[PDB]
Amino acid sequence: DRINTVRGPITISEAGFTLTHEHICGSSAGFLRAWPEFFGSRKALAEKAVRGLRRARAAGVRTIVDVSTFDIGRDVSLLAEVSRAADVHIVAATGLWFDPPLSMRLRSVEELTQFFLREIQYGIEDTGIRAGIIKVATTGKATPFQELVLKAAARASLATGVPVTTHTAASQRDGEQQAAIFESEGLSPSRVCIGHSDDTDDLSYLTALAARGYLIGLDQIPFSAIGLEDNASASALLGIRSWQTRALLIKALIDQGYMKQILVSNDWLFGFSSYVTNIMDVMDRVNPDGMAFIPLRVIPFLREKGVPQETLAGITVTNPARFLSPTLRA
């Protein structure tokens, strides 16, 4: 009956409209503290984040889930600062993404389980801030280390009730192997979001996962390099499908009967250091609305396509609350 945020526990009712896959800053462990000038300054980054969260809040957002892991350079002290300033709840994450350092890559399943548990049950670093979600990643068939991470995430979820959310390459149908590994651990699909699922046009891939009880993360809705296709780096990151094509997958899954299984987000951020230097600016040029893109553009778009407001409130309020509220078994 409580969800952990960077400001402490909140009720299901307090979470309200929740974006389930976002970032304050996509970076690397230790990088923000070592080279804040990469972002102009820590101050400038903080300011940009407060502005964006305030705009999001004005558009209706009440909570974001920051799925930045240790190796995404998650700085929960920065999260707490911006959450306070903007009055938007922020759920922090544990887990590991694609850039684990050696001190992580060398660890056993038992050790990784202890680390994820520490961040959920005790706190992150010395902040006392506890993670409310576990983030994991594969890009095609899991490496041996990625298997350890998936197993450890499942075990941490099974001991705490905190859910697991994933990065996939939806083209490579990764959710299928992620699912297989989670189920081998006894994890309920009700505690798992298969993320970046909006990157495919193969509806049958999505429906098969949904039929199994998985949550489906349609979470890069504004990602498109339409208008900048000759920007190789931007095209690689954003793809060449329109935001409308991505958004229409939400309607497609509603129509199949899977509205309760849908989670929607922007996968936005206010700083971004793990890619080409100015990728943040390019992204802002693509989507000036930032995190407010879902409420301001996507919801009205789906309404115009015939989706009732009530269904959209279900997807953006009810589903996230059911996903996040700790349980074995949602």
Alpha-carbon distance of 100 to 127, in angstroms, equals 22
Partners of 271 in the beta sheet?
25
Which two structure tokens, joined as six digits, stand for 5?
């945020």
* Residue 89 annotated as part of some ligand binding site: no
Task: Pick the binder of a second copy from 27, 83, 146, 266 (CB under 8 A).
Answer: 27
The reply on whether position 73 binds a second copy by CB under 8 A is yes
The site map against a second copy for 32-61 (x = CB under 8 A) is -xxx-xx-----------------------
Alpha-carbon distance of 189 to 139, in angstroms, equals 20
Looking up tokens 């990764």 gives 174
Residues 154-183 that bind Zn ion (CB under 5 A): 167
Alpha-carbon distance of 305 to 301, in angstroms, equals 7
The count of other CB atoms within 10 Å of the CB of residue 54 is 16
The reply on whether position 118 binds a second copy by CB under 8 A is yes
Which two structure tokens, joined as six digits, stand for 160?
């705490």
Task: Pick the binder of a second copy from 101, 186, 288, 306 (CB under 8 A).
Answer: 101
User: How near is the Cβ of 222 to Zn ion at its closest, in Å?
Assistant: 12
Partners of 135 in the beta sheet?
95, 165
Which two structure tokens, joined as six digits, stand for 162?
């905190």
The reply on whether position 145 binds a second copy by CB under 8 A is no
Binding segment for a second copy (CB under 8 A), chosen from 8-16, 95-103, 202-210, 219-227, is: 95-103
Residues 221-260 that bind a second copy (CB under 8 A): none
The reply on whether position 74 binds Zn ion by CB under 5 A is no
Which does residue 71 touch among Zn ion, a second copy, none (CB within 5 to 8 A, set by kind)?
a second copy
Instruction: Note whether 259 and 314 are within 8 A (CB).
Output: yes
Q: Which is nearer to a second copy, 83 or 273 (CB)?
A: 273
> Based on the number of CB atoms within 10 Å of its own CB, is 245 exposed (0-12), middle (13-18) or buried (19 or more)?
middle
Which does residue 62 touch among Zn ion, a second copy, none (CB within 5 to 8 A, set by kind)?
none
Closest C-alpha among 249, 237, 157 to residue 209: 249
Alpha-carbon distance of 199 to 196, in angstroms, equals 6
Give the chain's largest Cα–Cα span.
51
Which does residue 184 touch among Zn ion, a second copy, none (CB within 5 to 8 A, set by kind)?
none
Residues 248-277 that bind Zn ion (CB under 5 A): 267
Contact positions toward Zn ion, by CB under 5 A? Answer: 167, 267
The binding site comprises 21, 23, 135, 167, 196, 267
Site residues for a second copy per CB under 8 A: 27-31, 33-35, 37-38, 70-71, 73, 99, 101-104, 106-108, 111, 114-115, 118-119, 124-126, 273-277
